[PDB]
Amino acid sequence: GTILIDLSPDDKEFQSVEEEMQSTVREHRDGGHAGGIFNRYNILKIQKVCNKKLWERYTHRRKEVSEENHNHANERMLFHGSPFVNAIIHKGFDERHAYIGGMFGAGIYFAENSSKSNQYVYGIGGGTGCPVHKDRSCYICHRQLLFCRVTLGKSFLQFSAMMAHSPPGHHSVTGRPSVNGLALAEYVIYRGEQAYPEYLITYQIMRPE
Ligand SMILES: CC(C)Oc1ccc(-c2nc3ccccc3c(=O)[nH]2)cc1
Ligand SMILES: [Zn+2]
Numbered sequence: 001g002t003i004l005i006d007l008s009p010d011d012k013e014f015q016s017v018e019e020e021m022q023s024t025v026r027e028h029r030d031g032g033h034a035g036g037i038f039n040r041y042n043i044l045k046i047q048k049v050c051n052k053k054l055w056e057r058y059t060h061r062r063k064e065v066s067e068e069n070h071n072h073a074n075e076r077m078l079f080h081g082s083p084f085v086n087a088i089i090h091k092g093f094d095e096r097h098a099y100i101g102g103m104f105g106a107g108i109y110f111a112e113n114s115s116k117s118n119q120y121v122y123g124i125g126g127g128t129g130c131p132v133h134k135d136r137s138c139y140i141c142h143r144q145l146l147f148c149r150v151t152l153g154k155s156f157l158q159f160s161a162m163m164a165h166s167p168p169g170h171h172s173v174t175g176r177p178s179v180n181g182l183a184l185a186e187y188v189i190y191r192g193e194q195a196y197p198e199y200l201i202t203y204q205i206m207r208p209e
Pocket of ligand 2: 130131132133134135138139140141
């Protein structure tokens, strides 16, 4: 029951999502190995993901978390990159979309930095890059990221150089960077119902001039 609605580039909603995508690019400690070498994107399309059942699944869980946390869902908008983007938008997040080997355990991982999520669009470590050219830094092939509504609730703070259950008494984990002063936070949820894939963003990475 998913439909995708194209946003016009003239729409304020398109512009605000594009700005979050572009403004949260950073350099990565791998020199571009996983996600490619780029400072910005060419945004090709932004689509709203509409699914009544998945939205109601999300809001139901959000209310449960809010009620366990002094009426505070602690809702964020965060990026997610995955080879399973097309499954996620149709069936929702679940255990199959977890990063089993993630540093905060087997859960579903999200980033404040769009460029962090870009490292996972072709798999863990960028896999073998794009299917057409086998290039993790492909400037031709179209990539997709999700910009997701995520319920964190009470989040367990992990200081770090950067499914399972949430730590007891918590609804998520926050990976705070403790080495790279430019990195933004990363977050992990352990219930697929705590995220909704609100925007599907189609883009290319751009070769630096
Ligand atoms: C089958 C593999 C690719 O499952 C994964 C799917 C998504 C991710 C993923 N991990 C992240 C870790 C930190 C910050 C962001 C992400 C992310 O966007 N996706 C990891 C594994
Ligand atoms: Zn390619």
